[PDB]
């Protein structure tokens, strides 16, 4: 074991990520950045960061009745704000900007000519 | 498959939002011109 | 694969599309009004 009580159960039916502390203890306190982030809620031994795609980033600890679990660091890249910079996408975006600036330039040309 | 749909969908979100910014600045300048006329 | 977030992205795209159509209509109507 080596005091690595923190485990994760993933690939659930519903999109989420749950971290399991290998302790059946009262007031199992999870710590963040060297300080406790919250004491254990009643009758539930697992801390749930939430849905999978939130991309949690940080350093997390665990302490039950015994000494602290050796902390597990989790990096997550369920990237949501991702696009591909392939030839088609860049070409379409640049075509779109060209036509947009063209029409607004025609409009301002008309406005300045008539005014 | 569906991931590519997400990529193109969010790209459309960003760049049509950018088009909307272009539209609102155009609205601002034409509003200034019309208010000067009126 | 989860369809929940991409569907909301599609809904936002369509909302932005009706936004863009309305804004283009506003711009063209005001351009016509400025002409007349």
């Amino acid at each position: 074991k080596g005091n690595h009580l923190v485990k994760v159960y993933d690939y659930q039916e519903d999109g989420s990520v749950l971290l399991t502390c290998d302790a059946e203890a009262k007031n199992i306190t999870w710590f963040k950045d060297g300080k406790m982030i919250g004491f254990l809620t009643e009758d539930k031994k697992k801390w749930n960061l939430g849905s999978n795609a939130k991309d949690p980033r940080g350093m997390y600890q665990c302490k039950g009745s015994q000494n602290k679990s050796k902390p597990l660091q989790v990096y997550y890249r369920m990237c949501q704000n991702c696009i591909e910079l392939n030839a088609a996408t860049i070409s379409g975006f640049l075509f779109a900007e060209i036509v947009s600036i063209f029409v607004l330039a025609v409009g301002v040309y008309f406005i300045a000519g008539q005014d | 498959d569906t991931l590519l749909l997400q990529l193109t969908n969010t790209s459309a979100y960003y760049m049509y939002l950018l088009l909307l910014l272009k539209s609102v600045v155009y609205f601002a300048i034409i509003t200034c011109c019309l208010l000067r006329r009126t | 694969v989860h369809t929940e977030k991409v569907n909301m992205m599609s809904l936002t795209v369509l909302g932005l599309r009706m936004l863009f159509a309305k804004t283009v209509a506003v711009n063209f109507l005001l351009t016509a009004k400025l002409f007349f």
Binding site: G92, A96, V99 | - | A32
Partner: peptide, 29 residues
């Protein structure tokens, strides 16, 4: 693929509609 077709068709129809409305305003003059 298909959404990309939607955006290209959107671009061309916006151009066509703007041109048509401007030219209709010109002819109605």
């Amino acid at each position: 693929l298909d959404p990309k077709l939607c955006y290209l068709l959107d671009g061309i129809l916006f151009i066509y509609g703007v041109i048509l409305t401007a030219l209709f305003l010109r002819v109605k003059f």
